[PDB]
Amino acid sequence: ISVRGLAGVENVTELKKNFNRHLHFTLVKDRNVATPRDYYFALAHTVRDHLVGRWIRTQQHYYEKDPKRIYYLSLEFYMGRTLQNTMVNLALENACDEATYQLGLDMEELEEIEEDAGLGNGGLGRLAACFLDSMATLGLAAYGYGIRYEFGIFNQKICGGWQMEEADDWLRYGNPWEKARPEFTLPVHFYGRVEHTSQGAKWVDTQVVLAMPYDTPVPGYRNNVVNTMRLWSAKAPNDFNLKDFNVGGYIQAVLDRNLAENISRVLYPNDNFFEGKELRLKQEYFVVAATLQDIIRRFKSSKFGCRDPVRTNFDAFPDKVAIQLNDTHPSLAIPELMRVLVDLERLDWDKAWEVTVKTCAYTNHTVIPEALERWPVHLLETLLPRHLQIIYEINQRFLNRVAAAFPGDVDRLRRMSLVEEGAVKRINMAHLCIAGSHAVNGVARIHSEILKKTIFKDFYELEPHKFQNKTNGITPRRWLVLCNPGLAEIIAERIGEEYISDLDQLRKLLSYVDDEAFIRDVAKVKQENKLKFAAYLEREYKVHINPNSLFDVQVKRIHEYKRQLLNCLHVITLYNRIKKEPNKFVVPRTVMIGGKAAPGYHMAKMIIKLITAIGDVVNHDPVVGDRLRVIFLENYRVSLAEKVIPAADLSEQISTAGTEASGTGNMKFMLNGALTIGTMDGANVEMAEEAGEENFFIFGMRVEDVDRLDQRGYNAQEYYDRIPELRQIIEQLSSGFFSPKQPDLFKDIVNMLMHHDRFKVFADYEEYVKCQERVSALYKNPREWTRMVIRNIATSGKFSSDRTIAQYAREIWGVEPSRQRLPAPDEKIP
Amino acid sequence: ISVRGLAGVENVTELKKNFNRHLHFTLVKDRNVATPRDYYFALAHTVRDHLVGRWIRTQQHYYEKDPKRIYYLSLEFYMGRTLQNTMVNLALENACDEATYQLGLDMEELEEIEEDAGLGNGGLGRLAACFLDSMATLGLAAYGYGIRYEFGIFNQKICGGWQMEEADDWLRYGNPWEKARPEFTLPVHFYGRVEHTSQGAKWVDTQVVLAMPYDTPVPGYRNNVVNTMRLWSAKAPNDFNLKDFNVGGYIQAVLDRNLAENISRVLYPNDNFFEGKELRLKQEYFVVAATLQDIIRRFKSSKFGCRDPVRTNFDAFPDKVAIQLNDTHPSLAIPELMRVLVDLERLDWDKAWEVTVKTCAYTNHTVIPEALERWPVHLLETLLPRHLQIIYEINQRFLNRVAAAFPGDVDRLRRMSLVEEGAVKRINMAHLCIAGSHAVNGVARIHSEILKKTIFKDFYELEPHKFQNKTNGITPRRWLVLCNPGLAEIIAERIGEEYISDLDQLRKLLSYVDDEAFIRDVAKVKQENKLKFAAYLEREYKVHINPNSLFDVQVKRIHEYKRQLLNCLHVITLYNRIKKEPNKFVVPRTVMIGGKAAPGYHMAKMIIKLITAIGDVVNHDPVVGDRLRVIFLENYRVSLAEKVIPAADLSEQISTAGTEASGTGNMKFMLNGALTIGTMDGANVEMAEEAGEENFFIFGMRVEDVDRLDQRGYNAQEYYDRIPELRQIIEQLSSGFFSPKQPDLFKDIVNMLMHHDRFKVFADYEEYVKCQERVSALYKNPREWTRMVIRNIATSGKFSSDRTIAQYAREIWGVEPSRQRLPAPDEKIP
Ligand SMILES: *Cc1c(COP(=O)(O)O)cnc(C)c1O
Ligand SMILES: *Cc1c(COP(=O)(O)O)cnc(C)c1O
């Protein structure tokens, strides 16, 4: 059937009775009333049963051996569905497929019922999920720590061409994967004040919110390692949240509990944009405060909570603990770790600081200013009084270091401060992270260099040793084996199965680049994938596409820097050329654009309306026929990504050079048989460098050209003046060609493009359509297109998150990865 | 070990492996980290496994045979713990005891970990729980319908002698008994307006709240019948509760969902007191609206949703459905049933009314005016516009009936109206229930008569056939076998086990009233029970009592009508007499008073403070020694009741004649070997009538005397003037003898007692202490005390809820009870 494992005789039988056990005992139903949803839960519980045995022994193991623990703090974990992925990593897919078949059910149909765990916005949240899978696969004693939001990223609905947001109640029917652990509930403090008494400061008169943990298993790939992802839930204490007496109402007091619990209710839907709301800041401290207590508790036990030197010496803390900051969101971990060590454990400042800097590491994800976390001091002052005091003290000592290193450089002092003066004083969280971490890293080589040359130049000059680079990557398991079994199978037919946990081996496919059978096969799976997607489209969304056309897709969050607008300009150009010479042949294309816009991002929502507007015109023009279709992929999410990427021919990674830190969707497309048209931005550079620029469609300005243009001054009018095709499009938008009933509907877009384009869209237009012509030319030659595809796939190995993690492990965390199978799952009950 | 069933070889082994299965697979723990709480859950899941098989077949059965269904609507279901009760009804107690023993655990210790299901206030809520058990035991196709509050009755804490309320988060660790059924979620409407168009009225522009059901199994006693208790939870739709667009905030919109969901958040802690809050009215419509849709859906299927006459003829509705109203709380079921039949199903008014009256029945629980539900019309007008219109129309037609029956009786017309004029117009819910129900019943013979003679006299004259009586009762399973296995065993040694489901057979114990061994045994179990309670007291609450003293206990909600105050006056009297003649012998007593006061009931909370105040003085007076102890039983609830009642010698049921409708605690004490000192009120009359007034300690005014006194005019000063002992007590309270630091602390109590005593406490004082002397005299003669106890126990059979239900079944519901074992639980999987 494929290498989805063995469909053993004993195990298919075992699976079936357990499926029935759960349907009866767990779901309390009987075959005559069970619905596809009940069937999905019976299977889910059956699959979950197979990894609890391994989960327990993996955790017990770490307790016995006591290795260095890796804590990955992130406010986002974009997990997606977990049924299939678990089957894959446990080599249970074929057996389950067989068993459910014999039970007379379609597994694929049941998989579609599982709700996505959308606890993320985009890149940052998905990176964290890929990292978790890789860390488990490399046998690291790693824990994912975050917030269990009851409402993840909103579900997007397109009404009248506009985006409509609606609550993502992903827990409505329950989550069979998580395991509530009320018994490990911890208290977290807010507000209050600071008392300076005799021997130390005291954080007093605080409001308490409880943090209840929920554990979700993270199985490695076929090695029997099952790590833990612990998500915190907010819970109100029963006392003061009732006991602070003297009139108010008993009923009201109970109803008001949903005020402390609102902390974990919803994820902020902002991608690469900072919103200084109090609720956000509370979420950030909540995950940090709770997580640290858990970290120290585990440390206090270790082998020190037995003997060792005997005296809670936190000198070994950094040797046993490593906490990674996914961006600046969990940055309060730095002052919080100090608060505990100094205030509670009573270590002297300097010893505490040494421990802190040595166990923390920060990962930066973007260079755009509006994405930078700068919290107003009045907010920190009110909510976390003691932490503000600690930050000021950290700032005081750090600046003194700078003054001593650069005597008389007074501007450098204000530039590097963690405290920013002005309208309102703010705390620069990124500066806090650099100072309290022993390693700071970019997510792609060019991004890492830009940090050193630009944004954090002063910091780099101060401590050059801190700055590193760790190019992102994706997990080959979910992003290849799981979403594209067809491609995975043909690859395995030639080079084996070891590449799933050793992607570098894909290089061996280079020697089949002229193989006639392989070329035919690679081309065949892509065709089958396109056919399956085209079908899904009519199935779930309804209104036909042509599977023979080139599948041009751009899927990612809607941003001005991602330039979905530049994609739009090309689409309109194609249309206009067809309308000019109707009876001329052009390569057919289905351009698919999908993504979510943050609710308050007006421009982004205006762009979604433009895309659908273009589609309304283009898709109903009889002269165009089936040569050009414009489709807006609704509710883009992980599960939707697993469907479109395998069916894509052209991947669009066209951000303005220097704005996309790395990107990961790009890598997803490369490994799945799509060719890339993009700019020399983020990881695109390392991808073209790995595949050879000849096998990539690079166009536009490089970083240097962008900067030259800024010195000069960017004037969009010039481009409008010298390019008639560009002019024609802008006047079409301005006159209502795309919005008849509301002719001035797109005035904001035109106004912006002509007068305040921060991402110089017009500047890359000419080179962009010229380059698009080149891809169309190559698509006309199937054999050569496929051969170039083989060159990309065979060369994408460097982009596996296993490689990224192995580097973090060795160069930051100080641990050694291991592909050693944990001693089976085998029963056992001590 | 006792007759807690057989401890079979095959079944004790089977239990143990399943206990381990769950500990591993369900709890995801391993013996080395499992805590008593984990052990309790493994056992709970193991026990729950044994009744799912029976649950499924019982329900499937009713679907096949299609008998008349009984729907018990109640806003309260005071369930308590369910582990032991399930073991008892499934004859699993000994096997579980054995198995857990072999696993090296104490079952009793694990039982104590289960949280009470406190979804009730007192009598009314517990009656509903006893009824559910009896209905299952008598094999009736009955369903309990209510609200799944996430916060039940508050947990009471005594601080400084004052009651402190704190949230009852009974779901914190989860509920292994319930089964969420998200797939049967229903929509419920609120607000909106009424549109009168061409063919009928339309309820329009309504706010929608979803009702999600949770099913809990209700096993009958050893007959393999497992009925269902369905509790509704409020859930916000994802749409409008987000989709009603045009600024407000996306985050805020999501946070605001906890506004529609506040409907099922907390139970109103009012016992026999009406609070006209909107939230309450919403809870009342919510349970009614959701439940009815479920009832009709099941009816539409029946055997009509196949064939029968063919044409949704609701003429057979009353033949297939019976809905019982537990008080007036679910009274909106009457107009709601009409709304559906008329507005949605389009039946003519008269046909709809006929169906409605014929399927509904109302149970009244009290005669005090402040407990009566009179909803302001402006509230119904805003929240349920169409229902108000229907009520007015029902009122119009009913009054016309009255006018036609009593021509010219204009006062009778205003007196009987469902609408009350005055300050604000209100809707008398009790009048609504009488008019739209075919049967109205009291809960005790005297209460039932009072309804006919007083409160509902006019209604009785109009339709004498509606009014009935159904004396309350309690379940012998939880209230004897479960809480007092020792007494149950010795009874079974003589007369067998058939009495557990046929309590009348207790009469056979009358022939052992002179049996020397029995007298010794009955006396022995009571001593063992007292010893176990005295221990529990020091264990969990700490500060000694003497097990040889008479255990004088009064446990029920704190009310002015229950007269805990009269109990207090006696306690102080005892104290004062001892202080007068210290070296005189008096029978030792431990008087225990326990109960919860509604948060806003100032007097009730003042009484709790008085009780603890008396204890502070009495319990620390060296001259008193161990002869007199005053203890306030904290957090009285079902689980606490199962501990004190079996250990009681004297039961206090001293309400003012004519105020306690029936009472049920009284019956609990009678069946458990306690003698009763009380007034001729509620069921007390039927109890003394059953045991013989000679075996009861009756004192005080009868109803007639109370009324004579009211004609005359009650003057408390008279009693104060003629009774020196009474005078001495009042002046002690007034001068601070019981409150040194705050001498005027109890001025409200004294003021009330002397000037506004609605329950004439002083009037029953003399006869009360005189009578208390008589019980002390009899306690001095162990043999005779025990013999009188045997007379009460042997004669309590009439007070089993099986008898009550059998009567409801035959005289109201029109169904026949059956003690037929359902065809085993046996596997099966169709
Ligand atoms: C991989 C992924 C992303 C990131 O895409 P980029 O093109 O790097 O912005 C965003 N959303 C989802 C659903 C993803 O799977
Ligand atoms: C039986 C019971 C009641 C009712 O007691 P009465 O004396 O009839 O008021 C109240 N609360 C609990 C805990 C009960 O078990």
Ligand SMILES: O=P(O)(O)OC[C@H]1O[C@H](O)C[C@@H](O)[C@@H]1O
């Ligand atoms: O003790 P910590 O590491 O917090 O948690 C360890 C626990 O993790 C998971 O919930 C699985 C469970 O078997 C294990 O006992």
Ligand SMILES: O=P(O)(O)OC[C@H]1O[C@H](O)C[C@@H](O)[C@@H]1O
């Ligand atoms: O169809 P209704 O009567 O609503 O519910 C019937 C269901 O009740 C319970 O949840 C047990 C389950 O086995 C049964 O199928």
